Symmetry: C3
Subunit: 109 residues, 3 copies
């Protein structure tokens, strides 16, 4: 009876040991995925910070989009293609267009 | 005394088996959270990619905001409300405003 | 022999107990990281939502950046520095520049 009980005990111990081995694998696999995600989050935080710094964004107090950037309150917007010149146009106009207008005036004068 | 000892060992083995059952559940639960975050991060990466592509942003080669996009280095900005026309105005002006100016000149000529 | 067997069994159970305590600690530590990451992803989703609402963004149907915002189909862009007035300038122009042009015309008249 006691040798049987010892065999029972040892069988139970082997099973526990096997389960523990698998658990160590599972915790490792998990911690690899978590480390991956922690790194990814760090990179995302940088990207979000940069987008926030660099996007031309709405200014609630001004009730308009603002071309302020960092420590510079006013800045150019460039690479703006020519806007439609019409009574209903809501396109921004660029310096080539104002140049043309100024030339019409100087020619007029 | 050895029957007592055997029963105490079997008791502790039962306890350990219970711990292992709990541990397995915890690991599964933890992995469900990690899975959710891994998939949330993939979604975030796409969002950030698209925001970077679509937000009018600062350009460190221009020292200005740049309307480059896709295969065109210049693009229009539209749905721009009329800017204040005043000596100290920093508002963008639209094609309707330039149209009016051009019309004043034209009528004179 | 059997008293000896029992001693060896107890020694192994002691080792198992140490492994279980370590595993618990590792799972705790993993979950502290996962919690930190879940929160960080929550913050990121808020930043992304806000950047989307507030960035001046590309509009596929317009093929242009759009100063639409919220319920308002058109809005101002302000804090725009004066653009180059030249035949190949792609700088946006501001209200102070159009004011100046408008005063040339009113002078010429």
């Amino acid at each position: 009876q006691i040798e049987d009980k010892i065999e029972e005990i040892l069988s139970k111990i082997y099973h526990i040991e096997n389960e523990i081995a698998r658990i160590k694998k599972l915790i490792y696999e998990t911690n690899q995925k978590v480390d991956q995600n922690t790194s990814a989050i760090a990179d995302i935080n940088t990207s979000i910070t940069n987008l926030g710094t660099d996007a031309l964004s709405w200014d609630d107090e001004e009730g308009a989009f603002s071309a302020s950037h960092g420590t510079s309150g006013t800045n150019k917007i460039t690479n703006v293609a020519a806007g439609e010149i019409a009574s209903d146009s809501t396109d921004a106009v660029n310096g080539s267009q104002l140049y043309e207008t100024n030339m019409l005036i100087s020619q007029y004068n």
